[PDB]
Design a protein around this ligand. Structure first.
Ligand SMILES: CCCCCCC(=O)O
Ligand SMILES: [Cl-]
Ligand SMILES: [Cl-]
Ligand SMILES: [Mg+2]
Ligand SMILES: [Mg+2]
Ligand SMILES: [Zn+2]
Ligand SMILES: [Zn+2]
Ligand SMILES: [Zn+2]
Ligand SMILES: [Zn+2]
Ligand SMILES: [Zn+2]
Ligand SMILES: [Zn+2]
Lengths: 137, 137
């Protein structure tokens, strides 16, 4: 395990700064009660040998997802029983995630932009764009 | 027929300016001697009432493909005898196409960004990015 090496590695927690996130959740066809709002969300990203770990948690919703990824290599995970295909890449020095949910014909473009101890995440699906800001912790 | 109303609408013609294009074609698994280089290429994009036409032509290669699209709506076109899926969206003032090649398990990003007078097309598949510049015909 390594916790340094890239600006986007570390332990990030959401702030009150959020833009259009319910519209993004709705564009995913998900119920706003369970998936929307601005509940405390954590992103932890670190390195393990030749690959990376990305753990997303929302403790309010008792929700946790641990993602293994190698840069530029397709991976597969699940949310309940829906398969999610993803590929993380570095582009312009930002971390990007290409996230496909083929059984729901949904493509999500995630982008992580670091500015000091702040992380700005952009979420895009179809023509809907949302942003959330995170701080180091 | 309407030829104005979006910066990317018009008749565009390739220039000598091109960047990393053969690496993009290679990452797609296509022969360079037939699909690489910088052969004269035209993109014509215009509106027809309730949809757009996007015509791509490479006269040296006897290639002419008439794509019809509605923004935010998935369409299909043929390759060999297999289906290619696309969906065009606006990213503010620019045009983006999300392309699935299911036979080959590839996802291609196209972007059309107008700066002049001049159109910059970006092609991206995984971590490989290429660019080509077009001038108004
Ligand atoms: C697979 C993409 C090859 C198309 C080449 C012509 C173009 O620049 O759009
Ligand atoms: Cl998909
Ligand atoms: Cl897919
Ligand atoms: Mg988040
Ligand atoms: Mg072109
Ligand atoms: Zn370890
Ligand atoms: Zn809530
Ligand atoms: Zn691991
Ligand atoms: Zn997909
Ligand atoms: Zn460049
Ligand atoms: Zn994509």
């Amino acid at each position: 395990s390594e916790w340094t090496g890239k600006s986007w590695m570390g332990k990030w927690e959401s702030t009150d700064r959020i833009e259009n996130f319910d519209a993004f959740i709705s564009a995913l066809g998900l119920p706003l009660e369970q998936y929307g709002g601005n509940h405390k969300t954590f992103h932890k990203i670190w390195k393990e040998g030749d690959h990376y770990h990305h753990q997303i948690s929302v403790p309010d919703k008792n929700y946790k997802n641990d993602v293994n990824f190698k840069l530029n290599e397709e991976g597969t995970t699940q949310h309940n029983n829906t398969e999610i295909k993803y590929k993380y890449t570095e582009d312009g020095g930002n971390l990007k995630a290409e996230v496909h949910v083929p059984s729901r014909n949904k493509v999500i473009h995630d982008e992580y932009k670091v500015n000091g101890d702040e992380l700005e995440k952009t979420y895009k699906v179809g023509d809907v764009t949302a942003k959330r800001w995170y701080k180091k912790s």
